[PDB]
């Protein structure tokens, strides 16, 4: 039997999740939608040929007793309240990142979900589902390179829109690494420091520093060095290297396109779209959520606790962006509810 | 509508197709299976959690009116009779390659299908659906390397089962390249020659020559040199290089796993089976079949005609296997039914 | 103590050898030169600031008692006579390839050398000294991939000059693979066959077929497939893959230049010059010869007998070029003098 | 003419330089040696078949008027006094790194050299002669990736001797990157900071932190992140990546050895010896020195001023090692003498 889904927020990513649920993946149907732009909601039903109700708001959607799960894909600042409303129902909840735009909001969601008899929230950190990143983590966990001492990573994007701010370097971009590293390493963060190399001439946006260097430390002492470079021009690329006691692991060459020998060069195309880079991870992530719902079991993907960790770390990083000083992080031990 | 599927042959690939139809793809349910090994059939039903009938043979399964489409996934030599029996029904038919193991068998199938009012057979030539191979073809077709003069290909398997015969080097293995190159180049064959290099000590099957070299020539004069090496030990690999007038195109190494630096080496894993190497291609081809069946429309993928055309060249190769002499090929034009 | 060298032929490669001997390598001095173009010879003296005598011909140069070794770097057709004269002296002899332009010439040399008390000839087949090619042979010889069954190789050149003939595809280009493969495999050839794929539109030379496919068979059964492509446009490239019973070996990409990420591509440069490609090999080869002469020991590089094997094989290939048919090769057993 | 050389310090590197000068490179002869271990010097003479005088100390050796140049290859701490003595002579001076073990000693040398009628000192920072590193610099200097924003580098070593100390992570290992980067970027340093990640279990030496992270900043604002890992086990490796405004450049994998397909992996060998890694650079660096001396021209390699920059920066690094705090660097303008 089919997992009946409501979607709250039918913009870009909302529509892409609808497409996933409707066209790409198995076992679900979108039967309700809402958007504060009623017209956007109506277009979704129309464009994807859904047999679905358009609700005027989130509150009314959430009272529909036939909806098994909700996807929250509205503006980030709007997640917190909506998630708290859905927690007054029994529905499963897939929220895109962030769990909340403040760490205070995140803690509320955590505290409330912790009052429930079982976990219902999955947060949209898709990196964990990417085949390559997953395969590296698995290899690391065999012990073949010993303990992880240093991690070096890059988050490379070709160009940004007019609306991209200095803070979004953290909240939209580094956030992926923020969720990824503690999971990768099975460790907790103790600090974050953002430093600014010389400013790129390619930056067109007021207040945006690019590139940015993020250094994180963990409780076991692993140091993580992330390069964030969002006006890099050449392509979209995610790089990851783990330095171990006895060896190293890194992500392979990405891409399926051919190797061209021509005009005194050998070359391969580089991905230009993060959308395309992570198509697989999005599919895998959402299919897993649906599969869990379908058997009336809690999600096994990133949780509200993960969302809270990310929120705390992002806020520490936003603080660090002001003065380039190291900010400490102390995250509480995970409630057993979240293991 | 959800397509109700029967699967005939529930070995390695039968199982993989059941898995994908059940857990990954959309719009299908496996409702019946059969295998000459009843235990294998029962194992498939249980391992994939099916509510499926287990029929004692193909003929009984084919006479179940509730089945919309059948998958023929038995030993290659068994496809011919099963496909012919299925053509006595109104079911859609997906057969794995080869269409048959002889030219005469393939021709029987085409002759019978031509008596029907619409086309119902798709053949599992999945290479055409592989994203990398498609990307190479599309780049070739831009003209960037000029005309294709030579193609070099490898079809590498680590080992074979005890039932793998010399003839199967062509009908089970080379058949992929036989179909592929004529699609890739939009050209047809004028000859094939099989030669036998130094026999590997790794061969364990009586009568099997390994490796084998296949030289195919096309009408436009492109020469294709295929290496078939099915006891290679190291891994499963498909390699493709197109030599043009002004450049070259090559398929990249396939791999998701990490690069490991350890013990005086830098290494990456190689796939050990088709099952994972071509998972995308199998998913795509099968989804397309199911989507067509759902509309009660003929398949748009490779046809029994493509199967026959390949069988002509395969039969030529099997003839060449006897004396290592070149065998001429001149295939008939595509009948209107198959255009 | 310094090996005194005379150079016979002071053209492009003659000058390059002079340069090596004078400015790059250790233990030698060019004290005499000759060229049928006297002006070229004088120029070589001035240009390399030599303390050397210019002789009118090879005969007179060869009478200088102070010369320990001669370099034969004239037109290929001139090698035979000069090498035969030099064998009337006790001097060591480095001849560039070919040993002789006919097989009968090569045999005359071998027969004459066999009367001497020690071996004095090294032939300039430099591939054997290329570090990459050597490293591959070495790894092969460890047994790690088992016995070599098939060799796939490419000799890629961007364009040719107007003097380049069909037969030069063998005598100037394939000759390197002809010397290389029997050495690589510790084997003897039994046949060669040249075939012509579709003719490239890039060919501008009368009578030239390009590309050419060369297939060689060996006594142990290994099949060698070489692609010769001399109007390839994109670069100069030497490729080598050995298919073994239990694994494969291939040369890596040549070049030390950086990997560039730019403009939606990842790229490395491709060499356009065979000269640049084989700088190291030429240096290593000549240094070895000099080092042997310095000890008054026989050269240990490719011998007149290797020159003979090359000549017989090349002749067979030029024969095959007429009709694309296989031509047998039965090389006599190696004389103990050459073992 | 032949450059007559004296060598001070005939240990591992001094013997390696003697070997270069005698058996590999052109244009030099070792005619004098000294070592505080007299038996080591005598042994160098025997082992390399030198026609050389053994002197009991540096002072005595420096009085041989037949010596055109001296090589200083003693303990680092002995370089300063010896170089200063040598500057009272007219001989040219090749000193292995470091110029001096204190910045004050380096200044003394600089100050003294500045009084002379020509520059005579070259310092053994061989990285600048490495073909791959040079090719990367050259490409960077074309402007193709825009301005350099960040540099990421690794200095990876398998294991260290029992006498390797924490400070040697800087003075023996990071010193190479210290000289390299300011040259690479044509910039000057403004700061250095050494941080200590998780301590490796592979460390056997009391007080040694491994790995170590070094962050250098430059006047133009480029940030350099170096990973120093000297108990890495797997191999010896130098990595370099330059992140530009519009692209990236990175050094390719080192090695000419083959790609092996075997045992479910594709692999290439990793160098285990620093010696073999930089053999080319050592040869080139020394040949260039000898070629300059042959002409009575000043060296064009790394100078005493480069030695001073390195000593200042190393000193700052050793200071940073105490508390992991950033240390400023402000080197004086380069004297015209050293331009
Ligand atoms: N990689 C990822 O995981 C990833 C990628 C893209 C976007 N996202 C996240 O998805 C969310 C949406 O991003 P987007 O790119 O689609 O933005 P968007 O602006 O296109 O779409 C958001 C939609 O939400 C609607 N909306 C806003 N507030 C609402 C409310 N309270 N209730 C209902 N609807 C509301 C808007 O009208 C709009 O239609 C954001 O949280 C974004 O961070 C995540
Ligand atoms: N397209 C591809 O890449 C790909 C990959 C693997 C296999 N195949 C094809 O799939 C088919 C099956 O191969 P496999 O690897 O699964 O082999 P397998 O040996 O694992 O399984 C074959 C199954 O067929 C059963 N069988 C044999 N004859 C039968 C008959 N008359 N009726 C019913 N069942 C019968 C056997 O008992 C066995 O269970 C072959 O045609 C093979 O060429 C294609
Ligand atoms: N091993 C290699 O890779 C390689 C590379 C280049 C050339 N070669 C060989 O080197 C030889 C010379 O080639 P090149 O490119 O220098 O050609 P070139 O034409 O530049 O020079 C040849 C020189 O030989 C002189 N010469 C001709 N006949 C002579 C004779 N009887 N005595 C003395 N001098 C004579 C010519 O006047 C000319 O100066 C050829 O055999 C060529 O095949 C080998
Ligand atoms: N550039 C490079 O990459 C590189 C590599 C290795 C060594 N080096 C440098 O080479 C120098 C030597 O290192 P090594 O590995 O050969 O060490 P080593 O200990 O093997 O040899 C040093 C030699 O110097 C002798 N010696 C010590 N003090 C002396 C003095 N006052 N006068 C004369 N001789 C003296 C010692 O007896 C010994 O024989 C060091 O400065 C080292 O840092 C540079
Ligand atoms: O049946 C399989 C299948 O066709 C594979 O794709 C091929 O690689 C194997 O050689 C063959 O035995």
Instruction: Write down the residue that tokens 């070995």 correspond to.
Output: B11
Crossing angle of the two packed helices B79-86 and B103-113, in degrees rounded to 10: 10
d(CA D307, CA B226): 59
Q: How many whole angstroms separate alpha carbon A64 and alpha carbon B213?
A: 65
C167 and C207 in contact (C-beta within 8 Å)?
A: no
| Angstroms from B242 CA to nearest CA on chain C | 12
End-to-end CA distance of chain A: 28
Using DSSP, state whether B154 is helix, strand or coil. strand
Q: Name, in order, each residue with C-beta under 8 angstroms of A219's C-beta and a sequence gap of 6 or more.
A: A187, A188, A189, A190
What is the experimental method? Answer: X-ray
Picking from C307, C254, C264, C283, the residue whose alpha carbon sits closest to that of residue C125 is C307
Instruction: Report the distance separating Cα A229 and Cα C143, nearest Å.
Output: 47
CB-ligand 1 contact for A126 (6 Å cutoff): yes
Instruction: Using CA coordinates, name the residue in chain D closest to C144.
Output: D262
Cβ–Cβ gap A220/D199 under 8 Å? no
Q: Which of C202, C6, C156, C176 is nearest to C92 (CA)?
A: C6
Q: For chain A, give the longest Cα–Cα distance.
A: 65
Q: Which residues contact D225 (CB under 8 A, 6 or more apart)?
A: A213, A225, D150, D151, D152, D153, D213, D214, D215
B265 and D267 within 8 Å at the Cβ level: the answer is yes
User: With 0-12 CB in 10 A as exposed, 13-18 as middle and 19+ as buried, what is A276?
Assistant: exposed
Q: Torsions phi, psi of B18, nearest 5? A: -60, -45
Identify whether the C-beta of residue B99 lies closer than 8 Å to the C-beta of residue B87: no
Bond preceding residue D211 cis, omega within 30 of 0: yes
Count of beta carbons in the 10 Å neighbourhood of residue D31: 19
Q: d(Cα C219, Cα C330) in Å, to the nearest integer?
A: 10
Å between C197 CA and nearest CA of chain B: 6
Question: A144 to each of A147, B150, B271, D234, how far by Cα in Å?
Answer: 9, 43, 19, 11
CB B53 within 8 A of CB B59: no
Centroid of chain to Cα B120: 18
State the Cα–Cα distance between residues B300 and B54, nearest whole angstrom. Answer: 30
Asked if residues B35 and B60 have their Cβ atoms less than 8 Å apart, the reply is no
The angle that helices D304-323 and D103-113 make with each other, rounded to 10 degrees, is 170
Q: Give D100's contacts (C-beta < 8 A, 6+ positions apart).
A: D79, D80, D83, D106, D108, D109, D307, D311
Neighbours of A295 (CB within 10 A): 7
Contacts of D250 (CB under 8 A, 6+ apart): C258, C259, C261, D136, D239, D240, D241, D242
Nearest by CB to residue D139, choosing from C139, C255, C258, is C258
Exposed, middle or buried by CB within 10 Å (0-12, 13-18, 19+), for C145?
A: buried
CA atoms of A152 and C99, how far apart (whole Å):
56
Closest residue CA from atom 1 of ligand 5: B172
Report the separation in Å between the CA atom of D35 and the middle of ligand 4, taken as the mean of its atom positions. Answer: 10
Enumerate the H helices of A116-273 as residue ranges.
Answer: 131-141, 168, 175-185
Measured from the Cβ of residue D325, the count of other Cβ atoms closer than 10 Å reads: 11
Q: Which of C17, C70, C96, C276 to mutate to test the pocket of ligand 3 (most atoms within 8 A of CB)?
A: C96
Closest CA to C5 of C16, C18, C15: C18
Is residue B125 lining ligand 5, measured as CB closer than 6 Å? Answer: no
Nearest to C263 among A234, A264, A266 (CB): A234
To the nearest 10°, report the CA torsion of B38, B41, B42, B46.
Answer: 170
**Nearest C-alpha in D relative to C135:** D257
Q: Which atom of ligand 2 is nearest to the CA of B95?
A: 41
| Residues contacting residue C112 through CB under 8 Å, at least 6 positions apart | C84, C87
Rounded to 5°, angle at Cα B202 from B201 and B205:
105
- For residue B123, report the distance from its CA to the centre of ligand 2, in Å: 14
d(C-alpha D270, C-alpha D268), whole Å: 7
Torsion angle in degrees (nearest 10) through CA of D151, D152, D156, D161 = 60
Euclidean distance between CA atoms B84 and B91, whole angstroms = 12
CB count in 10 Å sphere of residue A336: 6
d(CA B100, CA B221): 28
Tokens of B320: 């060449």
Judge whether D6 and D67 are in contact, CB under 8 Å: yes
Burial A86-113 (b: 16+ CB within 10 A, else e): bbeeebbbbbbbbbbbebebbbbbbeeb
Separation CA B258–CA B56 (nearest Å): 45
Instruction: Name the nearest CA neighbour of D190 among D226, D220, D153.
Output: D220
**Euclidean distance between the first and final Cα of chain B, in Å?**
27
Q: A265 and C261 in contact by Cβ < 8 A?
A: no
Quickly tell me which residue has 């480095």 as its tokens.
C94
**C270–B contact, CB cutoff 8 A:** no
Closest CA to C260 of B268, A236, D221, D246: D246
For residues D211 and D213, give the distance between their C-alpha atoms in angstroms, rounded to a whole number.
Answer: 7
Q: Are C241 and B225 in contact (CB under 8 A)?
A: no
What are the Cα distances from residue B332, in Å, to A23, B191, B329, B335?
Answer: 39, 14, 10, 8
Report whether B225 contacts B214 (CB < 8 A). Answer: yes
- Rounded CA-CA distance B278/B96 in Å is 14
C-alpha–C-alpha distance, residues A271 and A166, integer Å = 24
Please indicate if any CB of chain D lies within 8 Å of the CB of B273.
Answer: no
Ligand located closest to A34 CA? 1
The backbone region for B269, taken as left when phi is positive above 0, alpha when psi lies in -120 to 50, beta otherwise, is beta
> For residues D302 and D43, is the Cβ–Cβ distance under 8 A?
no
Chains contacting A (3 or more CB pairs within 8 Å): B, C, D
Task: Encode chain D in three state secondary structure.
Answer: CCEEEEEECCCHHHHHHHHHHHHHCCCEEEEEEECCCHHHHHHHHHHCCCCCEECCCHHHHHCCCCCCEEEECCCHHHHHHHHHHHCCCCCEEEECCCCCCCHHHHHHHHHHHCCCCCCCEEECCHHHHCHHHHHHHHHHCCCCCCCEEEEEEEEECCCCCCCCCCCHHHHHHHHHHHHHHHHHHCCCEEEEEEECCCCCCCCCCCCCCCCEEEEEEECCCCEEEEEEECCCCCCCEEEEEEEECCEEEECCCCCCCCEEEECCEEEEECCCCHHHHCHHHHHHHHHHHHHHHHCCCCCCCCCHHHHHHHHHHHHHHHHHHHHCCCEECCCCCCCHHHC
Phi and psi torsions of B335, nearest 5°: -65, 155
Contact predicate D79/D99, CB 8 Å: yes
Q: D242 Cβ partners below 8 Å, 6+ apart?
A: D136, D140, D145, D148, D150, D151, D184, D248, D249, D250
By the CB < 8 Å criterion, does A273 face chain C?
no
Alpha carbon of residue D21 to chain centroid: 18
Residue B240 Cα to ligand 5 midpoint, Å, equals 16
Query: Which residues, in sequence order, are bridge partners of residue B262?
Result: B265
Structure tokens belonging to residue C331: 């090389």
**Sign of the C-alpha dihedral, residues A18, A20, A24, A26?**
negative
D262 close contact with C: CB closer than 8 A: yes
Contacts of C267 in chain A (CB under 8 A): 265-268
Determine the atom of ligand 2 nearest the C-alpha atom of B78: 31
**What does the domain layout of chain D look like in residue ranges?**
1-143+269-339, 144-268
A27 touches chain D (CB under 8 A): no
Positive/negative CA dihedral, B136, B139, B144, B148: positive
Q: Which of D150, D198, D229 sits opposite A222 (nearest CB)?
A: D198
Q: ∠ CA C48-C54-C57 to the nearest 5 degrees? A: 130
**Burial group, residue A138, by CB count within 10 angstroms (0-12, 13-18, 19+):** exposed
Q: Do A32 and A115 form a contact (C-beta atoms < 8 A)?
A: no
> Are the beta carbons of C20 and C283 closer than 8 angstroms?
yes
Do residues D222 and D150 touch, judged by C-beta distance below 8 A? yes
Q: Is B69 helix (H, G, I), strand (E, B) or coil?
A: strand
CB B282 within 8 A of CB B126: yes
- The whole-angstrom separation of Cα A103 and Cα C212 is 69
Signed CA dihedral, B283, B284, B286, B291: sign only: positive
Is the omega angle on the peptide bond into residue C211 within 30 degrees of 0, that is, cis?
yes
Dmax over CA atoms of chain C, in Å, equals: 65
Q: Hunting for tokens 């990307």 — which residue is that?
A: B135
Q: How far apart are CA B213 and CA B228, in angstroms?
A: 6
**Sign of the CA dihedral running A227, A233, A236, A237:** negative
Closest residue in B to D232 (Cα–Cα): B262
Radius of gyration of chain C (CA): 20
| A258 has a chain C CB within 8 A of its CB | no
Which two three-digit tokens encode residue D58?
């540096």
For residue B194, the surrounding DSSP H or E stretch is: strand B189-195
For residue A5, the cross-strand partners are: A30, A69
- Which residue is associated with the tokens 């997906």? B94
Chain centroid, CA D125 distance in Å: 3
Check residue A237 and give left, alpha or beta (phi > 0: left; psi -120 to 50: alpha): beta
C128 and C179 in contact (C-beta within 8 Å)? Answer: yes
> What number of other Cβ atoms are within 10 A of residue D264's Cβ?
15
Residue A250, H or E segment: strand A248-250
Architecture of domain B144-268: 2-Layer Sandwich (3.30)
| Coil, strand or helix at B152 | strand
Class of the CATH domain delimited by C1-143+269-339: alpha beta
Rounded-to-integer distance, Cα D236 and Cα D140, Å: 25
Within 8 A by CB and 6+ apart from D120, the residues are D87, D91, D92, D93, D113, D298, D299
Nearest CB to C234; choose among B149, B233, B247 = B247
**Alpha-carbon gap, residue A34 to A6, rounded angstroms:** 8
Question: d(Cα B286, Cα B69) in Å, to the nearest integer?
Answer: 12
Alpha-carbon span C266 to A262, nearest angstrom: 13
CB A80 within 8 A of CB A105: yes
Distance CA D158, CA D164 (A): 13
Which residues neighbour A287 within 8 Å (Cβ) at sequence distance 6 or greater?
A25, A26, A27, B24
Report how far residue C26's alpha carbon sits from residue D24's, in angstroms, rounded to the nearest whole number: 6
Contact predicate B188/B220, CB 8 Å = no
Q: How many CA atoms lie within 13 A of B43 on its CB side?
A: 13
Q: Is B112 helix (H, G, I), strand (E, B) or coil?
A: helix
Residues of chain C positioned with their CB less than 8 A from the CB of A272: 264
D266 to B272: CB separation less than 8 angstroms, yes or no = no
CA–centroid distance for D123 within its chain: 7
């Amino acid at each position: 039997m089919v997992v009946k889904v409501g979607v709250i927020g039918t913009g870009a990513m909302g529509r892409a999740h609808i497409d996933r649920l409707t066209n790409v993946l198995t076992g679900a149907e979108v039967v309700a939608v809402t958007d504060i732009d009623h017209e956007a909601a109506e277009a979704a039903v129309r464009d994807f040929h859904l047999n679905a109700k358009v609700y005027p708001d989130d509150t009314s959607l959430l009272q529909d007793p036939d909806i098994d799960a909700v996807f929250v894909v509205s503006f980030g600042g709007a997640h917190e309240a909506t998630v708290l409303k859905a927690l007054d129902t029994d529905k499963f909840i897939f929220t895109e990142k962030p769990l909340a735009t403040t760490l205070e909001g995140a803690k509320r969601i955590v505290d409330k979900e912790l009052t429930k008899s079982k976990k219902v929230i999955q947060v949209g950190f898709m990196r964990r589902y990417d085949q390559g990143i997953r395969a590296l983590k698995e290899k690391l966990d065999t012990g073949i390179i010993g303990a992880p001492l240093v991690v070096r990573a890059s988050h490379i994007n070709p160009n940004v829109a007019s609306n991209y701010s200095n803070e979004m370097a953290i909240t939209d971009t580094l956030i992926h690494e923020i969720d990824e590293m503690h999971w990768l390493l099975d460790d907790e963060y103790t600090s974050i420091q953002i430093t600014y190399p010389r400013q790129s001439a390619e930056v067109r946006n007021e207040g945006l520093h690019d590139p940015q260097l993020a250094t994180l430390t963990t409780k076991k002492g692993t140091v993580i060095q992330v390069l964030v470079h969002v006006t890099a021009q050449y392509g979209y690329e995610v790089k990851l290297e783990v330095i171990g006691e006895t060896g190293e692991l890194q992500l392979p060459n990405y891409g399926l396109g051919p190797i061209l020998r021509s005009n005194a060069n050998q070359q391969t195309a580089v991905e230009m779209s993060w959308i395309n880079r992570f198509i697989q991870a999005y599919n895998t992530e959402v299919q897993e959520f649906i599969d869990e719902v379908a058997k009336s079991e809690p999600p096994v993907g990133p949780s509200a606790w993960d969302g809270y960790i990310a929120a705390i770390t992002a806020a520490a990083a936003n603080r660090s962006q002001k003065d380039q000083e190291t900010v400490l992080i102390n995250v509480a031990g995970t409630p057993t509810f979240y293991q």
